[PDB]
Amino acid sequence: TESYDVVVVGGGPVGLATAWQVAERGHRVLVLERHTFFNENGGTSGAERHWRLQYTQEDLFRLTLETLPLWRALESRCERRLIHEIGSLWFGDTDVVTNEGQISGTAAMMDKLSVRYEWLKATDIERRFGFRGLPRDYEGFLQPDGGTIDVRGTLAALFTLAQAAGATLRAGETVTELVPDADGVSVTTDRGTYRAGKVVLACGPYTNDLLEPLGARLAYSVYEMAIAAYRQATPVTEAPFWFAFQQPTPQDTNLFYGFGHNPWAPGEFVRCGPDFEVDPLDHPSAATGVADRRQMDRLSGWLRDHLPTVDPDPVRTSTCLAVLPTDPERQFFLGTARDLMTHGEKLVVYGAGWAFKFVPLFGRICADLAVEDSTAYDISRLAPQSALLEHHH
Numbered sequence: 001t002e003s004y005d006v007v008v009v010g011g012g013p014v015g016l017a018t019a020w021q022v023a024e025r026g027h028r029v030l031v032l033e034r035h036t037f038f039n040e041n042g043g044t045s046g047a048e049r050h051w052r053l054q055y056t057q058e059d060l061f062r063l064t065l066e067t068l069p070l071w072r073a074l075e076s077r078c079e080r081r082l083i084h085e086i087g088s089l090w091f092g093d094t095d096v097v098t099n100e101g102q103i104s105g106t107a108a109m110m111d112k113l114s115v116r117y118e119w120l121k122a123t124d125i126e127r128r129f130g131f132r133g134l135p136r137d138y139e140g141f142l143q144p145d146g147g148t149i150d151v152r153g154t155l156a157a158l159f160t161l162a163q164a165a166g167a168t169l170r171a172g173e174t175v176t177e178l179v180p181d182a183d184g185v186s187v188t189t190d191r192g193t194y195r196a197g198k199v200v201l202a203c204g205p206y207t208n209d210l211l212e213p214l215g216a217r218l219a220y221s222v223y224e225m226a227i228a229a230y231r232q233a234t235p236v237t238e239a240p241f242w243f244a245f246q247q248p249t250p251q252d253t254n255l256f257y258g259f260g261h262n263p264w265a266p267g268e269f270v271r272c273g274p275d276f277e278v279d280p281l282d283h284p285s286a287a288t289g290v291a292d293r294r295q296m297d298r299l300s301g302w303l304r305d306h307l308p309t310v311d312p313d314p315v316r317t318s319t320c321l322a323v324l325p326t327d328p329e330r331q332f333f334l335g336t337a338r339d340l341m342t343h344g345e346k347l348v349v350y351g352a353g354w355a356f357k358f359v360p361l362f363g364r365i366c367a368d369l370a371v372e373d374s375t376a377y378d379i380s381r382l383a384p385q386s387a388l389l390e391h392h393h
């Protein structure tokens with residue numbers, strides 16, 4: 001049985017950012033990853049992630065401002081720009097309300113916060129970005145500071161930095177049980193056992209599997225989302241992240257999005273996806289890894305009709321898992337299990353969120369909680385929410 005100050009369950013971006021932060025502070029840390037480092041079977045897949053500036057939630061705006069300098073610090077340390085401003089384009093029916101929000105209302109928020117943006121007509125959208133056949137009444141805005149994040153460069157950066165700082169990184173090892181006590185946490189995996197001062201759970205949608213035997217369960221939902229890669233057919237001037245807000249159809253939400261071009265790449269492929277209604281999974285093992293045929297046909301058919309700058313026959317389709325608070329008024333679960341179980345303060349938990357954009361900050365916070373029980377950042381609104389009735393002392 002090996003001893004560590006911190007054992008991180010999960011080797012995705014959050015786990016690696018946490019390990020790096022803990023190791024650089026001089027503590028003994030072990031990262032246990034069930035599959036391989038850089039795997040694409042969890043919530044982290046593909047080459048890119050979006051980081052918009054426009055929000056109607058004050059929380060997200062604040063998280064964005066606090067994370068920016070941490071990305072700059074990471075970019076400096078790994079000698080790689082990871083965030084690229086390519087723009088964030090929201091267009092279509094400006095009043096339809098969707099899980100992504102509403103254009104008009106978000107535009108009003110930007111007005112209030114002095115967030116700059118250009119308002120565009122259907123004609124402007126087609127001319128500048130190559131969309132075609134759009135209803136003449138579609139409008140939207142382009143927020144020019146919207147960015148796209150280099151996913152693989154970020155993971156390489158975190159892995160190498162954590163390793164250089166002394167973290168022990170182990171793959172192909174599944175944590176099966178955690179038992180916290182007053183002096184630390186006993187960790188069992190399919191390969192051995194370990195003792196930890198504290199454990200950080202950054203295991204994607206699997207958090208509840210390890211909390212269940214301890215009498216805890218968080219209120220988050222897991223969704224298997226479809227994603228397709230397409231070949232760029234025509235070179236273009238501008239290629240921002242885009243989201244098409246449309247009125248729903250009897251069969252689906254009729255919402256689609258594209259991540260935009262990847263500046264660090266040869267510019268050969270881009271990824272797009274449907275933002276359709278999907279029923280949560282009962283357990284992540286229910287995920288199939290097979291993109292839903294109808295959704296892919298709908299997405300490809302829409303690109304064929306409205307974005308001829310790409311070959312609408314996908315080169316590859318796959319899935320990615322989203323883990324989000326079940327209650328839409330909550331966006332992230334990040335704190336300890338202190339209010340959920342005895343000795344819960346010894347389990348630091350990152351349990352839900354649409355958060356690649358906040359990886360540097362969440363890693364720092366998890367590190368703070370694991371090494372000091374407190375963080376300078378206010379995480380009161382990120383409290384992990386229980387899915388069970390509150391009966392504990």
Ligand SMILES: *Cc1cc2c(cc1C)nc1c(=O)[nH]c(=O)nc-1n2C[C@H](O)[C@H](O)[C@H](O)COP(=O)(O)OP(=O)(O)OC[C@H]1O[C@@H](n2cnc3c(N)ncnc32)[C@H](O)[C@@H]1O
Nearest residue numbers: 010012013014034042043044050175203204320355356357
């Ligand atoms: C799926 C998805 C997510 C997403 C997105 C689009 C899609 C289709 N677009 C985003 C965007 O534009 N901007 C943004 O900020 N976020 C966006 N997201 C969300 C983002 O991808 C996720 O928030 C992020 O990937 C989460 O990272 P995290 O590190 O928390 O989790 P993960 O990569 O799933 O990794 C968890 C690791 O844990 C391992 N694991 C699981 N169970 C165990 C056990 N028992 N033992 C050991 N290891 C375990 C997994 O294998 C995984 O590697």
Ligand SMILES: O=C(O)c1ccccn1
Nearest residue numbers: 050051052100243257275
């Ligand atoms: O607004 C976002 O962050 C978003 C929405 C849909 C797909 C990817 N990213």
